[PDB]
């Protein structure tokens, strides 16, 4: 098993489709394994989607 503190992560499908700028670093980071699904950012994203 590879621990989370020791890997570099990127989603070049996401880079080709959306492209990364300053305005989408947080939901780019939301696809990373670093992101916690139980976070306030994701739950308020669901609130604003609702």
């Amino acid at each position: 098993v590879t621990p989370l503190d020791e890997l570099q992560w990127k989603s070049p499908e996401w880079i080709q489709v959306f492209g990364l700028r300053t305005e989408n670093v947080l939901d780019y980071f939301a696809e990373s394994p670093f992101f916690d699904k139980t976070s306030n950012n994701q739950v308020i994203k669901m609130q604003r989607q609702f």
């Binding site: 990127k10 070049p12 499908e13 880079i15 080709q16």
Partner: protein, 36 residues
């Protein structure tokens, strides 16, 4: 020459290898290997 990169001109880029079909050959490695 400041907005174009060497990513898919000299070599296949990472996204090229992902959306490419060697990547799904890895998933379907069992069907490609079959011997009668």
């Amino acid at each position: 020459k400041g907005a174009v990169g060497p990513n898919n001109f000299i070599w296949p880029a990472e996204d090229a290898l992902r959306r490419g079909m060697l990547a799904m050959a890895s998933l379907h490695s069992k069907e490609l290997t079959r011997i009668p």
